[PDB]
Write an enzyme that holds these catalytic residues in place. Structure first.
Site, PDB file in Angstrom:
ATOM      1  N   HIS A   1     123.519 -29.642 113.865  1.00 35.90           N
ATOM      2  CA  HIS A   1     124.362 -30.832 113.343  1.00 35.90           C
ATOM      3  C   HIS A   1     124.298 -30.579 111.741  1.00 35.90           C
ATOM      4  O   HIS A   1     123.713 -31.552 111.255  1.00 35.90           O
ATOM      5  CB  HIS A   1     124.139 -31.975 113.915  1.00 35.90           C
ATOM      6  CG  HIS A   1     125.247 -33.000 113.741  1.00 35.90           C
ATOM      7  ND1 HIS A   1     126.488 -32.606 112.790  1.00 35.90           N
ATOM      8  CD2 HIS A   1     125.992 -33.717 114.549  1.00 35.90           C
ATOM      9  CE1 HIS A   1     127.206 -33.486 113.082  1.00 35.90           C
ATOM     10  NE2 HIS A   1     126.863 -34.240 114.122  1.00 35.90           N
TER      11      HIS A   1
ATOM     12  N   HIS B   1     129.441 -33.848 109.242  1.00 40.36           N
ATOM     13  CA  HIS B   1     129.899 -35.314 109.494  1.00 40.36           C
ATOM     14  C   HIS B   1     129.173 -36.362 108.680  1.00 40.36           C
ATOM     15  O   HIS B   1     128.978 -37.515 109.021  1.00 40.36           O
ATOM     16  CB  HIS B   1     129.816 -35.521 110.860  1.00 40.36           C
ATOM     17  CG  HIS B   1     131.024 -34.838 111.642  1.00 40.36           C
ATOM     18  ND1 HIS B   1     131.084 -34.532 113.146  1.00 40.36           N
ATOM     19  CD2 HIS B   1     131.971 -34.023 111.392  1.00 40.36           C
ATOM     20  CE1 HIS B   1     131.803 -34.172 113.510  1.00 40.36           C
ATOM     21  NE2 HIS B   1     132.634 -33.568 112.413  1.00 40.36           N
TER      22      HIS B   1
ATOM     23  N   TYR C   1     125.607 -36.399 108.223  1.00 45.02           N
ATOM     24  CA  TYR C   1     124.280 -36.759 108.655  1.00 45.02           C
ATOM     25  C   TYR C   1     123.277 -36.009 107.807  1.00 45.02           C
ATOM     26  O   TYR C   1     123.573 -35.562 106.925  1.00 45.02           O
ATOM     27  CB  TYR C   1     124.100 -36.416 110.169  1.00 45.02           C
ATOM     28  CG  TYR C   1     125.035 -37.064 111.025  1.00 45.02           C
ATOM     29  CD1 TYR C   1     124.895 -38.752 111.265  1.00 45.02           C
ATOM     30  CD2 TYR C   1     126.384 -36.967 111.653  1.00 45.02           C
ATOM     31  CE1 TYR C   1     125.760 -39.340 111.723  1.00 45.02           C
ATOM     32  CE2 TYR C   1     127.068 -37.659 112.292  1.00 45.02           C
ATOM     33  CZ  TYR C   1     126.922 -38.958 112.435  1.00 45.02           C
ATOM     34  OH  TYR C   1     127.584 -39.986 112.802  1.00 45.02           O
TER      35      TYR C   1
HETATM   36  C1  FMN Z   1     133.606 -40.469 120.995  1.00 50.08           C
HETATM   37  C2  FMN Z   1     133.305 -39.369 119.993  1.00 50.08           C
HETATM   38  C3  FMN Z   1     131.981 -38.882 119.780  1.00 50.08           C
HETATM   39  C4  FMN Z   1     131.886 -37.748 119.163  1.00 50.08           C
HETATM   40  N1  FMN Z   1     130.325 -37.577 118.844  1.00 50.08           N
HETATM   41  C5  FMN Z   1     130.347 -36.258 117.900  1.00 50.08           C
HETATM   42  C6  FMN Z   1     129.031 -36.063 118.071  1.00 50.08           C
HETATM   43  O1  FMN Z   1     127.837 -36.063 118.893  1.00 50.08           O
HETATM   44  N2  FMN Z   1     128.677 -34.621 117.228  1.00 50.08           N
HETATM   45  C7  FMN Z   1     129.750 -34.244 116.635  1.00 50.08           C
HETATM   46  O2  FMN Z   1     129.492 -33.163 115.938  1.00 50.08           O
HETATM   47  N3  FMN Z   1     131.181 -34.669 116.600  1.00 50.08           N
HETATM   48  C8  FMN Z   1     131.310 -35.632 117.516  1.00 50.08           C
HETATM   49  N4  FMN Z   1     132.721 -35.944 117.659  1.00 50.08           N
HETATM   50  C9  FMN Z   1     133.472 -35.294 116.847  1.00 50.08           C
HETATM   51  C10 FMN Z   1     134.139 -34.101 118.192  1.00 50.08           C
HETATM   52  O3  FMN Z   1     133.278 -33.274 118.379  1.00 50.08           O
HETATM   53  C11 FMN Z   1     135.286 -33.559 117.931  1.00 50.08           C
HETATM   54  O4  FMN Z   1     135.284 -32.748 116.582  1.00 50.08           O
HETATM   55  C12 FMN Z   1     136.650 -34.522 117.379  1.00 50.08           C
HETATM   56  O5  FMN Z   1     136.611 -35.253 118.595  1.00 50.08           O
HETATM   57  C13 FMN Z   1     138.067 -33.818 117.154  1.00 50.08           C
HETATM   58  O6  FMN Z   1     138.222 -33.127 117.865  1.00 50.08           O
HETATM   59  P1  FMN Z   1     139.445 -33.580 119.206  1.00 50.08           P
HETATM   60  O7  FMN Z   1     140.678 -34.016 118.380  1.00 50.08           O
HETATM   61  O8  FMN Z   1     139.512 -32.409 120.167  1.00 50.08           O
HETATM   62  O9  FMN Z   1     138.925 -34.889 120.083  1.00 50.08           O
HETATM   63  C14 FMN Z   1     132.964 -36.979 118.403  1.00 50.08           C
HETATM   64  C15 FMN Z   1     134.287 -37.479 118.439  1.00 50.08           C
HETATM   65  C16 FMN Z   1     134.303 -38.666 119.704  1.00 50.08           C
HETATM   66  C17 FMN Z   1     135.715 -39.139 119.699  1.00 50.08           C
END
Ligand code: FMN
Length: 362
Positions: free
Chosen positions: A179, A182, A184
């Site tokens: 990771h 974002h 981190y």
């Molecule tokens: C509830 C939630 C939790 C997420 N947790 C992570 C995560 O643990 N790791 C990460 O890299 N991105 C995380 N994301 C980002 C998602 O992997 C993804 O990039 C994002 O939802 C955008 O794509 P989508 O429009 O298909 O939902 C999270 C998003 C949501 C909504």
């Protein structure tokens, strides 16, 4: 259509291009940050995905920043994740573990000893993280100001990622995802906005990428390059961490360096949930010609956009986050052009089965 055709992704072969993006759901057991049987059910329900990428998982206790996120450092965590991967494999799925250190997106109350979290520099993230109240419900809390890592502590961080990958292998995961996105820890070092260091881990792009490249080399040596992927979010701003005034040049530098290691995949988180400028086709071409494995795109994709970019040769697969939250059989729904279940975002974080395992399959 190409979304439903196989793709070799390092050491494994996905039967389709429809991947499950990592999603923190904050349902682990505390104490111990332990995955649960309910989490095993959730992942098992989604095992038709070309590849499942798990929720972000701690490499160490220090790495914790959110109450309810699981770890992959303790014997009890390893034992619980072994059951989850077994369930996915019993359904003929593939699963990668996303490994993180949250750095400054954390709170002292969930750090070892109750002390300040660590980062590249001693600057507060000026955001919130998610804790739990006395009844175990998720709550948002301002982040604690971090301490800058001392130069002599950086090898320990590299070793923590190395050991967590070794644990991921034992636990039966098919691949790991680092990771590096974002806001981190890894991204805190990458970004000039969060990294004010004056040692060899700050300043130039080469210094800011030093830690992530050390981690990549360590995990490739521990397991194998064809088992390693990386998530980046190098264009735009994410949880107050920008990518600096030369974001495109710096991103291309990092990608060229990752390519030298021969890793399995590059997963690009293109925008945060609040939006951002779309990647140009020209930049996608520049990425494509610098990286020779699988490229996964994510961020508000539709099937239509995925098919467009796959057919243009610019990405190989798409990771869906929220559509996979709400549709365990997303692959089948997309193949048949069926309606999708409506999302219930109030249950994305914390709680129990409701909003987690109760979204129906067709
Ligand atoms: C509830 C939630 C939790 C997420 N947790 C992570 C995560 O643990 N790791 C990460 O890299 N991105 C995380 N994301 C980002 C998602 O992997 C993804 O990039 C994002 O939802 C955008 O794509 P989508 O429009 O298909 O939902 C999270 C998003 C949501 C909504």
């Amino acid at each position: 259509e190409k979304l439903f055709t196989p793709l070799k992704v390092g050491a494994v072969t996905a039967p389709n291009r429809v991947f499950m993006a990592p999603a923190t759901r904050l349902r682990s057991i505390e104490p111990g940050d332990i995955p649960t049987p309910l989490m095993g059910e959730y992942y098992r329900q989604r095992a038709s995905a070309g590849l499942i990428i798990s929720e972000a998982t701690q490499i160490s206790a220090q790495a914790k920043g959110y109450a309810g996120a699981p770890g992959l450092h303790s014997p009890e965590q390893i034992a619980a994740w072994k059951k989850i991967t077994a369930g996915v494999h019993a359904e003929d799925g593939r699963i990668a573990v996303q490994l993180w250190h949250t750095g400054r997106i954390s709170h002292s109350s969930i750090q070892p000893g109750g002390q300040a979290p660590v980062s590249a520099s001693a600057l507060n993230a000026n955001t919130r993280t998610s804790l739990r109240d006395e009844n175990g419900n998720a709550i948002r809390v301002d982040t604690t100001t971090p301490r800058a890592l001392e130069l002599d502590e950086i090898p320990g961080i590299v070793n923590d990622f190395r050991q967590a990958v070794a644990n991921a292998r034992e636990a039966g995961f098919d691949l790991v995802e680092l990771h590096s996105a974002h806001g981190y820890l890894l991204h805190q070092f990458l970004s000039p906005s969060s990294n004010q260091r004056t040692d060899q881990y700050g300043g130039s792009v080469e210094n800011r990428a030093r830690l992530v490249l050390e981690v990549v080399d360590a995990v490739c040596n521990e397991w194998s390059a064809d088992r390693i992927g990386i998530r980046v979010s190098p264009i735009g701003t994410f949880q107050n961490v920008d990518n600096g005034p030369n974001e495109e040049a710096d991103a291309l530098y990092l990608i060229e360096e990752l390519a030298k290691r021969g890793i399995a995949y590059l997963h690009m988180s293109e925008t945060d949930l609040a939006g951002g400028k779309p990647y140009s086709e020209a930049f996608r071409q520049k990425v494509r010609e610098r990286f020779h494995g699988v490229i996964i795109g994510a961020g508000a994709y539709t099937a239509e956009k995925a098919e467009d970019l796959i057919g243009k040769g610019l990405i190989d697969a798409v990771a869906f986050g929220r559509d996979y939250i709400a549709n365990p059989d997303l692959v089948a729904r997309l193949q048949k052009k069926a309606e999708l279940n409506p999302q219930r975002p109030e249950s994305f974080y914390g709680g129990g089965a409701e909003g987690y395992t109760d979204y129906p399959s067709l």
